[PDB]
Amino acid sequence: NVAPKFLANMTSVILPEDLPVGAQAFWLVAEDQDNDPLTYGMSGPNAYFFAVTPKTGEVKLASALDYETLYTFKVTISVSDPYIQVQREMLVIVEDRNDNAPVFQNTAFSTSINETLPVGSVVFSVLAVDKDMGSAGMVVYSIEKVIPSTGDSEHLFRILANGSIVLNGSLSYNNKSAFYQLELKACDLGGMYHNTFTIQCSLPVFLSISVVDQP
Template identity: 30%
Template sequence: MEQLCDVADECVLQCEMIVEGEMKVYAIQVEIRDINDNAPSFRNAETQVKVSETAALGWRYPLAEAHDPDTGSNSLQRYELSGDEHFSLAVQTAPDGEKRLELLLAKALDREEAAFHELVLTAVDGGDPERTGTARILVIVLDANDNAPEFSQAVYMVRVREDVPVGTVLLTVSATDADDGMNGEVTFSFQKISVKAYDIFHLDTETGVITLVRSLDFEESDSYELGVQAKDGGDHFDTAKVSIEVIDVNDNAPEMAVTYWVSLLW
């Protein structure tokens, strides 16, 4: 029927018949009735949809409709969406009767909770039994910079002998950011440091390693406090304190102080 009548609800073929011996022509109408011999189908078996994790509730995305060559009640009747509570299906009927299919955001997204959502869109016809066709929808959640870096410790403490050689790694500060890509890339810097300490300690901006670049001297200073900052690819940051205690070693010889007393006898 689909080949002869396309999508017509009623299909009638007009033809003529000649009865042998009578030489008489009879007009005949042949009505072709549709049967549910086709299932709905989607042009693409899989669709990828990208949406920001900050998208507002009610965000919509148009979806391609299914096609069913059957007619009448055997044709496509409804759609169903399964797989995730974050999304629902909206079917809009245009003035000309055409149905427009849209994916609707029903619950707020969080990429750190789920970076992907897999949905199944099902098209159902009205036959008995029903025939169905499915398409897979993969929703990719795009990251937004909604997380700040976090140091593993609020205070880092280290005790160092004053005779450790220059180039020694004293400690490593570390911070993590739950965001993805540039939003999750953390760089380190000194946020608060004295001029003297800046000449003694070096902080690697990428690894957080603090090394000694000038010799320590307990007699010059027995402790240092440094403020460090971890910043992501946006404007979010965290701060921590580094406390360095310098341990004295026996690197100075005793110095004798002699006081002379002069006694005068008269």
């Protein structure tokens, strides 16, 4: 008897982290010089991630993957002819997908500023973080809404790429507004999730700005 032998590409497999439980993950494939019928299996502490169809070598996902928790792992794979069992290690490489949104770190979202604060001043700073890799983890910030809404007020504040909010026009307690509420959003630059290009956005956050009158 000649022992069966896994094909060369059985050393590793790449799988997306969003693969649903129940889906085909990959095929275990081996060859046997005697042309024996071959049966397939998987074992070890990480084998529970999969379910092998022993007759065919089809591998189905049996427990959810997550790049954020276990980005690679090893399993023992097995092929058996009628006479001998042959076992090797396979590396499972999990691919990141865009399954997290930016999350704002800040506890507090209020400040008070003097009405004569010069244009260009930094007024507040926010930070949002996204766990994903690459563009799926790059955060962009936006001012979604300003209250009161004018004409003036839409151009009054600007948020920069590092999360600093700047004063972009002049204030007046008496003649424009004693306050502003800024609705902010953070979004990633997108990536694949559930088989489609996906952009994730935070929950909205609200910054309360009190304007102090100065005579």
